[PDB]
Amino acid sequence: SGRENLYFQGTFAERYNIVCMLGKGSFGEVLKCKDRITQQEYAVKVINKASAKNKDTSTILREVELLKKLDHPNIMKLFEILEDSSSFYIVGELYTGGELFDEIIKRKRFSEHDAARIIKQVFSGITYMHKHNIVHRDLKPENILLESKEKDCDIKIIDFGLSTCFQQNTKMKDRIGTAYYIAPEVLRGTYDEKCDVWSAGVILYILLSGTPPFYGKNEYDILKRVETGKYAFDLPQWRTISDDAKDLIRKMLTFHPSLRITATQCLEHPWIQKYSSE
Ligand SMILES: Cc1cccc(Cc2nn(C(C)(C)C)c3ncnc(N)c23)c1
């Protein structure tokens, strides 16, 4: 506050009013804001500039400008990236349905029909972004948002492409929770687009069984399992799950990424086709 500081807060404070805090997201705090002129509401992520991975701010702006030009119904739309001396402000579509993990906590397990509806949308988004050589790396249920509270609303993947630009919060809200979804080759420091197929496979495993494939009491124990890549469908929870579902998951959780299916192949898989409309 104060005239000088408000002036130096730059174009974001001029253009937008903060209505309320919405919660801590990866990389930064998310707030609901309003465009002062139009009164339309948006979500804004406020990211400390100390959290930039790239020391050249112009590269961050370029990256985000490329992401603004993209358009797919299962990818969050971005409208603006603004700055002041301390922070980046990324403004985009506001959602009100909460995240996919909230929905996992609520429902516990999803029928094959319901899981296929959700995961097909994830696959569609991933396929689209991969066609533009964008990798998520951090795909997890917390980065899959429900557009609204309406029944069967569209899901929206958030933060897709921002991991090249920003490092995680110093204080993260659920660090152990991130280990479940990370691809083994990402842990090794050598990733390409296939890591998003792995993460989506972990999500699908959880939707169907209610349990993670790589588990443990702490981050270390979970990551030790991920690193070996060994998992099973031995739980009674898998007893009556279709062979087709298990086949898709096996292909997605293939250890070597060169041998792992593509996102496009996931969409074509018989299990997804069984539940698609026409
Ligand atoms: C890059 C960016 C900017 C603003 C918001 C997000 C994701 C997001 N995150 N969150 C949380 C759920 C508050 C973390 C949102 N709530 C409502 N609408 C949203 N779009 C979000 C991502």
Author numbering: -8 to 0, 70 to 338
From the paper:
In an endeavour to address the void, our study spans the classification of the C. parvum kinome and the structural and biochemical characterization of representatives from the CDPK family and a MAP kinase. Like in plants and ciliates, the CDPK family dominates the apicomplexan CaMK group. For some time it has been known that the CDPK enzymes control crucial functions including transcription, metabolism, ion pumps and channels, and the cytoskeleton.
Inhibition of CpCDPK1 was thoroughly investigated by screening with a series of compounds designed to exploit the small gatekeeper that is naturally occurring in CpCDPK1, but not in the other CpCDPKs. For example, similar to previous results, pyrazolopyrimidine derivatives are ineffective against kinases with bulky gatekeepers (found just downstream of the catalytic lysine in a Yoo*xooxGGELFxxI motif, where o is hydrophobic, x is any, and * is the gatekeeper), but CpCDPK1 is expected to be sensitive to such inhibitors owing to the presence of a glycine instead of the typical methionine present in the remaining CpCDPKs. Accordingly, over a dozen PP1 derivatives were found that inhibit CpCDPK1 with IC50's less than 10 nM. Indeed, our crystal structure highlights how one of these inhibitors functions.
